[PDB]
Design a protein around this ligand. Structure first.
Ligand code: CLA
Ligand code: CLA
Ligand code: CLA
Ligand code: CLA
Ligand code: CLA
Ligand code: CLA
Ligand code: CLA
Ligand code: CLA
Ligand SMILES: CC1=C(/C=C/C(C)=C/C=C/C(C)=C/C=C/C=C(C)/C=C/C=C(C)/C=C/C2=C(C)C[C@@H](O)CC2(C)C)C(C)(C)C[C@H](O)C1
Ligand SMILES: CC1=C(/C=C/C(C)=C/C=C/C(C)=C\C=C\C=C(C)\C=C\C=C(C)\C=C\C2=C(C)CCCC2(C)C)C(C)(C)CCC1
Ligand SMILES: CCCCCCCCCCCCO[C@@H]1O[C@H](CO)[C@@H](O[C@H]2O[C@H](CO)[C@@H](O)[C@H](O)[C@H]2O)[C@H](O)[C@H]1O
Lengths: 178, 80, 42, 161, 64, 178
């Protein structure tokens, strides 16, 4: 009857230990307030963005596109340096992706209207890495664990940059304390 | 005197008669409803126009209706 | 968390006050950090 | 046009308002000791006042002969921030509140707790609707064309005529 | 045919529930001027949710 | 079942493959509420106006009437320059033509949308009707988009389309106009 990760709390009813990444961690019982399918989708999506963003923060410190506009090795400062017109094109393209990927079903009321729709699963496996059922099941957990880690990392990266105004690697090499 | 009329939607519940503080109303035999009775207003010269009868009536719209009219000492409720 | 207590926290006036207080706080905090916005800056 | 108005940065009355406001605050400041909490409070008001006047000066908002900002709300885009953009923001938010509230009402009518859920909110159900408000314009438009937005006149009660 | 369990639309204009739908509760024998008893979800201004109607004053929507 | 244009949306209920210019594209579902024949008439009328307007927008840059008054290659500027008596005559023609369209939709609802019996050369008579009907709509739809471009761009530049392309006046430096 108890949570696995927090053994002194009753297990949340919507966490049945089936979904990848489930160790019954929900001490605030958020999964009682909000729909678990929507929560799971949201978790994976936050993870995938942060995985890219983490890689983005590092690569942007070293590699750049041509021009002084696409310089700046601090990622938070680079946001305000690059052309604003370019940011709009990214935004509107993401909008199109969000619409197409979700087949125009973009809210907790309708996103999981089709029974076959599963959280995070857009049927995207070009190289066929998850052909093996057993391997795919491991990868599902790895995706979520890496996404979870990247979320916390990007939280760090951003707050470190706000505090120092140095790059990720720049800060490590020239570590200055508070 | 005030005019009191009873319409044919009456279900013979007796609540208007019971509500009336001036004994204006009474129940009389009828065929039109399951209760086999209808409200009647034989003594409207004693009606003060308080409309307690209408408050009591359960039908929609009302089956008893009070139209306020020519005032008398009785209808104005004067003890002087 | 206790279901009866949670039911009480779901009553109209309790949710009313909490939600209005959060909304009010948001407006206060916007005006505390970005004061005197007569118009959208552009 | 707007010959009766002038940019607030070009306005002598608008500038005099700054001077007179600050002059009053500096008189108030002189009554307190440097470093005291009172002194610092007055200094913050002086800084905040300066920031406000300079912000309006740099904005290109027009000033009247009173030396106060006057807003133009006729639709011209050079004053979009004064009314049109606030308006779009208001409509988006207010439409959201209305749309999610309408959605919740309809959901609970299809239950046995149609009345109970009005005075004791089903909070999970409410949050589901509240979360879904961001595309209310499209939702509302489709609902209208589907014939699901409105009841027929013959299906709503009316009084005698 | 209107009978117990029928959904009916109300056509009496002075009714609180004019043009609304109620549920038939019973139909009285014959000779009764208003034999169809209907129940509603909404209460009227007097607080009642039931009233008697004639056949002319109602029209059936659903079957039972 | 599904729309051709948007494969993850349902087919519009009141449109069919038999209709000219059908791609099953009606996501907002205006064909469900409004009369389809009326929408078809409306679409064709817009199509025809914009095709003439688009061509009329560009032809003066190559050749214009022999005078100083008809020499303004910016079309919205030209509107202010040309004789008012001339514009009045254009207006009266338009009013006359709309009187005929009004008469069609009011007193002759049997007639096909856009059908004024105007085919001097018999181009879409026999076994080319479906084709030409589609070609009319496709070219009209293109012109409608083109007129959106032409009008708004002229507002910015106060130039004709070819004058804008030639001078490379691609970006708005003039907004806001007022
Ligand atoms: C599909 C057609 C398409 C077209 C015609 C353009 C055209 C343009 N892009 Mg865009 N872009 C596109 C798709 C497209 N993009 C997509 C799908 C993305 C997201 C993957 C972007 C992300 C992007 C960025 C970040 C930037 C541009 C920029 C530009 C402009 C300058 C590039 C140049 O010529 O050097 C040019 C108008 C640049 C710009 O806007 O210049 C100010 C710019 O900074 N684009
Ligand atoms: C036109 C552009 C567009 C469109 C149509 C969509 C559409 C969608 N997005 Mg996407 N998104 C976009 C751009 C877009 N997105 C961009 C540019 C990013 C950054 C990469 C994202 C990142 C993103 C995330 C992380 C998530 C979505 C989700 C969604 C879905 C729910 C949207 C919603 O309810 O938002 C309305 C907004 C709200 C209800 C509240 C958030 C308010 C703002 C926008 C951001 C909050 C920031 C703040 C710091 C949050 C933390 C505060 C505190 C708790 C610590 C919907 C399919 C969600 C989803 O799929 O869940 C299942 C989801 O979790 N999107
Ligand atoms: C309809 C009546 C009305 C309107 C249109 C305004 C408008 C305004 N008031 Mg006024 N005010 C009003 C009634 C009104 N007020 C009343 C009745 C009082 C007495 C209580 C006041 C007392 C008052 C004071 C003391 C101040 C204002 C201020 C403001 C400005 C706030 C800007 C802002 O917070 O944007 C930010 C937008 C939001 C916080 C809402 C957006 C919601 C979220 C954050 C965004 C979500 C993303 C989608 C704005 C011009 C301030 C000002 O600066 O004036 C120049 C200010 O200091 N108001
Ligand atoms: C009285 C009703 C009225 C309405 C509904 C609008 C509506 C609009 N006007 Mg405004 N406008 C008006 C009176 C009105 N205007 C008057 C009297 C003037 C002269 C003072 C203007 C001067 C004006 C300018 C200069 C502009 C607008 C614009 C606009 C559009 C934004 C919107 C369609 C803008 C637009 O782009 O129009 C298409 C725009 O640039 N209007
Ligand atoms: C979801 C709730 C909702 C919606 C969609 C509407 C919509 C409307 N109202 Mg109604 N109204 C409401 C609640 C709502 N109202 C409430 C609670 C009251 C009592 C104060 C009223 C009292 C009222 C009056 C007196 C009038 C309207 C009118 C209208 C119409 C025009 C807009 C307007 O004047 O609003 C004005 C309404 C207000 C200023 C009241 C405040 C609205 C509150 C803040 C909304 C409550 C939201 C709810 C608590 C959210 C919970 C959702 C959550 C559980 C998911 C429009 C159909 C007018 C009309 O008939 O035009 C044809 C009109 O004269 N309304
Ligand atoms: C301008 C008028 C116009 C009209 C009346 C139509 C009408 C139609 N189109 Mg066509 N279409 C148009 C332009 C138009 N289209 C353009 C420019 C394109 C190129 C993208 C297309 C591409 C297209 C395809 C691929 C298909 C259609 C189809 C259809 C039919 C079904 C969809 C529908 O109901 O749209 C009605 C929608 C609108 C009129 C747009 C909505 C307008 C906004 C949201 C409201 C406000 C607009 C504006 C501000 C009002 C100004 C008023 C004025 C006084 C200034 C219907 C006959 C389908 C069909 O079956 O063909 C037979 C179909 O498959 N259209
Ligand atoms: C909606 C369609 C439309 C509208 C409102 C206009 C309006 C105008 N045209 Mg344009 N024009 C059009 C279509 C249109 N035209 C088309 C399709 C062509 C190719 C034949 C032209 C070729 C054209 C030339 C060569 C000239 C104009 C000119 C003009 C302007 C003044 C006199 C005139 O009408 O001559 C109309 C001239 C015609 C040869 C009319 C052709 C008849 C079709 C049906 C229209 C006037 C603003 C004059 C101008 O001032 O240009 C700057 C001018 O010299 N037009
Ligand atoms: C059917 C008889 C008719 C007659 C008698 C006229 C006569 C005239 N037209 Mg008109 N015109 C007509 C049909 C006619 N038009 C039609 C059907 C159209 C639309 C296709 C026009 C479009 C038109 C334009 C754009 C202009 C004239 C102008 C003129 C005037 C000067 C031309 C000249 O004489 O040299 C002249 C009074 C010109 C004018 O009035 O300039 C002062 C002028 O600019 N006409
Ligand atoms: C200006 C000009 C230049 C021209 C600039 C030009 C050519 C460069 C354009 C660069 C573009 C193509 C980059 C594209 C940007 C790609 C973005 C960043 C992708 C966003 C991905 C998201 C973040 C997905 C998130 C999500 C995922 C993870 C999962 C989904 O479920 C949900 C969503 C939410 C979609 C130069 C270079 C010539 C120099 C000169 O000096 C000036
Ligand atoms: C632009 C502009 C202007 C003007 C404007 C105008 C003039 C307007 C009008 C408008 C109009 C004339 C309108 C109308 C309308 C109508 C109707 C008929 C409506 C309806 C609606 C509805 C039905 C809705 C519903 C809803 C939603 C959608 C959301 C949520 C809630 C609800 C449910 C309520 C000005 C100058 C001021 C300023 C500048 C700009
Ligand atoms: C002339 C002006 C040109 C500019 C027009 C720009 C608009 C472009 C339209 C894109 C297509 C929109 O199509 C519209 O999508 C939304 C989803 O976003 C659908 O909406 C559906 O899903 C949303 C959320 O997923 C639900 O809240 C809603 O109840 C449901 O109807 C509509 O059923 C569909 O009609």
């Amino acid at each position: 009857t108890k949570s696995l990760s927090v053994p002194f709390l009753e297990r949340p009813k919507n966490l049945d230990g089936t979904a990848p990444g489930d160790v019954g961690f929900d001490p605030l019982y958020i999964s009682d307030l909000l729909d678990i399918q929507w929560l799971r989708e949201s978790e994976i999506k936050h993870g995938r963005i942060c995985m890219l963003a983490a890689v983005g923060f590092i690569v942007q410190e070293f590699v750049h596109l041509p021009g002084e506009v696409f310089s700046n090795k601090v990622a938070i400062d680079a946001l305000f340096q690059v052309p604003s017109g370019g940011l709009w094109q990214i935004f509107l393209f993401i909008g199109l992706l969000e619409f197409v990927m979700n087949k125009g079903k973009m809210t907790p009321l309708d996103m999981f209207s089709d029974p076959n729709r599963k959280p995070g699963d857009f049927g995207f496996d070009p190289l066929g890495l998850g052909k093996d059922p057993q391997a795919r099941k491991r990868y599902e957990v790895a995706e979520i664990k890496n996404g979870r880690l990247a979320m916390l990392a990007v939280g760090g990266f951003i707050h470190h940059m706000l505090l120092t105004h140095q790059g990720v690697v720049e800060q490590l090499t020239h570590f200055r304390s508070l | 005197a005030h005019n009191v009329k009873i319409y044919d939607t009456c279900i013979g519940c007796t609540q208007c008669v019971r509500a009336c503080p001036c004994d204006v109303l009474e129940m009389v035999p009828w065929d039109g409803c399951k209760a086999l009775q209808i409200a009647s207003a034989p003594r409207t010269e004693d009606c003060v126009g308080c409309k307690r009868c209408e408050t009591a009536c359960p039908t929609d719209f009302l089956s008893i209706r009070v139209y306020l009219g020519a005032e008398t000492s009785r209808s104005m409720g004067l003890a002087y | 968390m206790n279901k009866d207590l949670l039911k009480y926290l779901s009553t109209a006036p309790v949710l009313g006050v909490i939600w209005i207080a959060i909304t009010a706080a948001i407006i206060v905090e916007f005006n505390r950090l970005y004061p005197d916005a007569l118009f959208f800056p552009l | 046009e707007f010959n009766n108005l002038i940019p607030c940065k070009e306005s002598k009355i608008f500038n005099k308002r700054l001077e007179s406001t600050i002059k009053k605050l500096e008189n108030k400041l002189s009554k307190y000791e440097v470093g005291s909490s009172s002194y610092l409070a007055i200094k913050n008001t002086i800084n905040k006042t300066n920031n406000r006047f300079h912000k309006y000066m740099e904005s290109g908002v027009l000033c009247g002969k009173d030396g106060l900002p006057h807003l133009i709300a006729d639709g011209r885009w050079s004053h979009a921030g004064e009314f049109v953009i606030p308006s779009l923001l208001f409509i988006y938010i207010s439409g959201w509140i209305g749309w999610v509230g309408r959605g919740y009402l309809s959901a609970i009518k299809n239950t046995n707790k149609a009345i109970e859920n009005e005075i004791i909110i089903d909070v999970p159900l409410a949050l589901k609707f509240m979360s879904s408000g961001f595309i209310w314009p499209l939702s509302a438009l489709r609902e209208y064309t589907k014939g699901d937005l409105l009841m027929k006149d013959s299906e709503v009660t009316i009084s005698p005529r | 045919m209107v009978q117990k369990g029928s959904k009916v639309k109300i056509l009496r204009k002075e009714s609180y529930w004019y043009q609304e739908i109620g549920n038939v509760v019973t139909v009285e024998k014959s000779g009764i001027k208003y034999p169809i008893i209907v129940r509603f979800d909404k209460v009227n201004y007097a607080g009642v949710n039931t009233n008697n109607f004639a056949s002319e004053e109602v029209i059936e929507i659903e079957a039972p | 079942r599904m729309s051709k244009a948007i494969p993850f949306f349902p087919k519009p209920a009141r449109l069919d493959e038999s209709m000219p210019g059908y791609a099953g594209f009606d996501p907002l579902g205006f064909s469900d509420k409004f009369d389809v024949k009326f929408l078809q008439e409306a679409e064709i009328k817009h199509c025809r106006i914009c095709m003439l307007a688009a061509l009329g927008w560009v032809v003066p840059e190559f050749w214009h009437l022999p005078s100083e008054v008809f020499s303004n290659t910016s079309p919205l500027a030209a509107l202010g320059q040309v004789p008012k008596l001339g514009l009045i005559q254009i207006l009266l023609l338009v009013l006359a033509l709309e009187a005929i369209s009004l008469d069609k939709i009011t007193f002759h609802p049997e007639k096909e949308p856009g059908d004024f019996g105007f085919d001097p050369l018999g181009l879409g008579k026999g076994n080319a009707k479906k084709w030409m009907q589609t070609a009319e709509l496709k070219n009209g739809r293109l012109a409608m988009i083109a007129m959106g471009a032409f009008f708004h761009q002229n507002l910015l530049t106060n130039q004709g389309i070819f004058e804008q392309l030639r001078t490379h006046n691609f970006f708005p430096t003039t907004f806001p106009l007022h």
